[PDB]
A paper describes a structure:
DispTs3, DispTs2 and DispLp all consist of a single domain with the expected (β/α)8 (TIM)-barrel fold for GH20 catalytic domains. GH20 enzymes use a substrate-assisted catalytic mechanism, also referred to as neighbouring-group participation (NGP), in which the reaction proceeds via the formation and subsequent breakdown of a neutral oxazoline intermediate.
Since DispTs3 and DispTs2 have the highest sequence identity, as expected they have a small r.m.s.d. of 0.63 Å. Interestingly, in the structure of unliganded DispTs3 an acetic acid solute molecule was present in a similar position to the N-acetyl group of the GlcNAc. The acetic acid also formed hydrogen bonds to Asp160 and Tyr247 with distances of 2.55 and 2.75 Å, respectively.
Author numbering: 3 to 324
The structure:
Amino acid sequence: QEKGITIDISRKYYSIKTLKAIVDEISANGGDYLQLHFSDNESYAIASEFLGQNSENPNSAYLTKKELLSLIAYSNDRNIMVIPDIDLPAHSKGWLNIMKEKDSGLYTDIVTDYSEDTLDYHNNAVALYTANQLLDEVLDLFYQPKFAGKQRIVLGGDEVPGSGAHQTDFIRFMNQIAKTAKASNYEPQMWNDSITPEGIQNLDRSFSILYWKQSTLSNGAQSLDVQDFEENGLSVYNYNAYSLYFLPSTRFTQEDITEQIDYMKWAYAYNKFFYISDYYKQVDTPNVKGSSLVFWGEHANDLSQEGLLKQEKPLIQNFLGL
């Protein structure tokens, strides 16, 4: 049973010092991985040659290449694998908006008709070609020889518009970017929520699944659960959107953080998943491989770096102990 911490840096800048401090806590407590969620609607938060984010000076928009590589090395030195999390096709407004500036011709050819935040996953060649360039860069940057044959990448797949009604396009798109990952010897991962019973039969079985919340179909019916992923030979990680999602904010006191700990102490188990009918449903299938606490950044706008650590370090310690 692996344990990970997931940090959203797309929504919130963490300095290299803060991130190494977090890695220290992970290390001190026996964690296995740090998932770095760096591409979302608000920003693409690491250096990128493809996107023109080439500054080698620290800044407040993105980690430099040297900072990032340093973070990965620091983690690997403590036997902690770093998992890139780049979100496709949706949650893409950060990098798409860069493409709109950098090459507006190409932008028109890759963006969905009605969602500025979504790449055209509808059988669009130029869109896949563009995404693959960006993925190639990521898979290279995140290369970790100390974990060859164990590397994973999160490719997104959450909250994808049109996916219920165009599931065939969606699954074909995810399978295509999974090939890219697999060609570099990475295991591809995606969130659970946009895969429907119609789509699962066709999803590449190399995928493992980050299970945050059981979906409801358009029509009202309950969608895939962990047992359904089991039946399709798909491994699952518990990312329970109640017990394992936390949003740091200056609106919290330390006593509020203790109540969060107290809550997580009874709500969290590695195999208690967020089902429609039961928020902390214990599932005992053999395809559960671990769990992650996730720190989303939407509410962290003017938290100081110290304040980030004040909230996060206690929650990391507790989670990695339970």
